[PDB]
Symmetry: C3
């Protein structure tokens, strides 16, 4: 196994890896957000990638999701575990809580969601990837059991609505998303989750709630500074969860799980 | 009358027409998906066009809806009847059922939906086309009565949600679409239906359900291979329905219906 | 204070201003829709801008929202009050009624919604603007009290759903939008409201309902001609409301309100 880690806002710390070497790569879809950081957690090979770049320079609409996933695939990653900062759409999901999300609702509009775009020899045909179960259940289960072992406030499921951004939602939108069954809100899960599935990678997401979105009365206003402060306070939780989870993934059996993902990916392609 | 036929996935068979001649055309909006196939059904002139191209090469996001409709308009089509493969969002819409859809919900994001884009001398101004009744009721009624005459399982109405694709929906999305009142799901109805209306064409759609989308428990997973297999099993139904419907359209009175569409189209344009 | 006025469909009359001088400007985001019209209402400096251009030439998808707001910002506008023609999604919002909207739901797909797009030296970084309260409450309150003083049918709140257009909604869409909590429907509020907020401008909207959208039974069909006719009949109301409101804004205290908007705008930017 080899674990890709895509680090989100306030949740991307190279110091998580030992024996670090940076590696700039190129892909048929362009350059990834930043250099790949190759390293290890205990005996497990990992590849860390900052979603928003070295200096947090890249807006969610313009993150190169294709290049990021393709680069991790080419580096040999069998798994991708990510972190993402999000807002809470449910009273029971408190700021600082982790949510091991199991569904999404797409509200993005400007984003390529397939490698198979008719313009790349490396991905020929039309791909219709199944999304009934977008996140790897086995990885999610190890995250859930590990969060429990650590005593962390963690939710075992949740539906992430991904908005285009970069603005936050209106209050009317926040309310509407709750009625649609969304539990947490962010700007990056789609199309990252979709492209991972096309690549035949086991993908899971550690979502960190930083605030209640503006549906909720009598809370502080949603703001960049409040998001960043809450992340600073809680980032250690994601780091511990990754550090403790990854060696357990490394000693689990994956051949069958990975073979089924590979088959799903290859059989989703219509060839001419 | 002259009937344009846009054939969808597994539902585009040139052998439906007699006296066939292929004709490659160009439009101010680019090239259509494939050559126009000119021919006849009994005494009625028809024009068949494969939505996804000769070799099923074109993803739904990149189908040239403008060129397809413009080409059929220029060829003299008064009517466009299409086929489309779709998923079912309702228990009563079984795989293999036909749905004569009467509404849509747009979930597409990347698609031009008007000929009047400010860049074409052939379509000057701003067009705000009415969409309260997107599909031609008279054609729909002939399809419905003909399906009954053939003894086919057919639904007399239905709301198609068109997603951007090319991925299938998440389970959270599938559930949400049901709450919005969607009955079937596909990737091509919008903007095809909109552009037909701008062109003053009577447009109707034969939607063929191939599976229950992933909202439904205890069904096979949604997949390309299962969609194609179900289409192979049921394609004869769409072919018979078209073959039997088209001569009845050819002997019906349309002058008033077509005049009202023409007026609606022309009066929807704001000129400078 | 200096009041930007963006005039919508049938609701853009230069004769509202005295001492008029036209001024064509350029911006880092391109040219605004038309010349800025500098003038006065009583003693208050104003800048009028036709949203759709001189000759109503520009479709809602292609209005340069960035250039319009940037141009008004650069001209020194502290406030932007706009007019917009809309459809009603509620029985109680009758054609001819004004709605002082306080929320939106975005259904647009093709539109830049930030100045901070990574390509402009004038707007560096990533901006995540809060949208819990998208419209300036103090301006809205002056509009509401002024409409009452004028005896006008006016609604003190309302949620605008902005669709991509240029087509009108399907009936299935119209119904769905009501379930989401939308009250009125248009094609221009987003991203205009978002960009104003990024610019630190107090923004409010005078929405004029021209018809019931097609959810409602036993009404005339929605059409361009009917929209324009209803606007012709009711445009005087918006003109009076603006004329009477603007001198009251000009004699109100704004330093604190504007300072808070400025802080919100500047603190929403993540720098590298
Ligand atoms: C630094 S500010 C931008 C970051 O904030 C995260 N985030 C937190 N709370 C919310 C919220 N309520 N709504 C939305 N859309 N995003 C939110 C978002 O995913 C992104 O990672
Ligand atoms: C060959 S695989 C792609 C084809 O499958 C049709 N289709 C069938 N079932 C579904 C479903 N459940 N969801 C969605 N989105 N599309 C579906 C779709 O319209 C396209 O024609
Ligand atoms: C001249 S025709 C185009 C103009 O009509 C306004 N408008 C009025 N009624 C409706 C309606 N029912 N639905 C939608 N989308 N827009 C509507 C719309 O905002 C634009 O300002
Ligand atoms: Cl939507």
């Amino acid at each position: 196994v080899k674990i890709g880690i895509i680090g989100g806002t306030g949740l991307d710390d190279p110091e998580i890896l030992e024996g670090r070497t940076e590696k700039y790569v190129d892909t048929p879809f362009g350059k990834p957000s930043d250099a790949l950081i190759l390293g290890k957690i205990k005996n497990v090979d990992c590849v860390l990638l900052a979603r928003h770049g070295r200096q947090h320079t890249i807006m969610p609409s313009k993150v190169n999701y294709q290049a990021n996933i393709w680069a991790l695939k080419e580096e040999g990653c069998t798994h991708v575990i990510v972190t993402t900062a999000c807002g809470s759409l449910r009273e029971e999901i408190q700021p600082g809580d982790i949510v091991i999300i199991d569904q999404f609702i797409d509200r993005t509009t400007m984003r390529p969601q397939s490698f198979y775009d008719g313009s790349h020899s490396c991905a020929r045909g039309v791909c219709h990837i199944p999304m009934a179960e977008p996140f790897c259940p086995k990885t999610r289960e190890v995250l859930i059991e590990t969060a429990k072992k650590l005593g962390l406030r963690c939710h075992s499921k949740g539906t992430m609505v991904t908005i285009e951004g970069p603005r936050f939602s209106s209050r009317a939108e926040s309310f509407m998303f709750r009625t649609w069954g969304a539990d947490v809100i962010n700007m990056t899960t789609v199309p990252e989750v979709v492209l991972a599935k096309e690549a035949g990678i086991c993908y899971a997401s550690i979502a960190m709630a930083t605030d209640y979105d503006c549906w909720k009365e009598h809370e502080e206003a949603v703001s960049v500074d409040r998001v960043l402060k809450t992340l600073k306070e809680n980032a250690n939780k994601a780091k511990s969860l990754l550090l403790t989870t990854i060696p357990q993934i490394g000693s689990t059996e994956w051949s069958e799980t990975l073979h089924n993902l590979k088959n799903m990916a290859q059989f989703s392609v219509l060839l001419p």
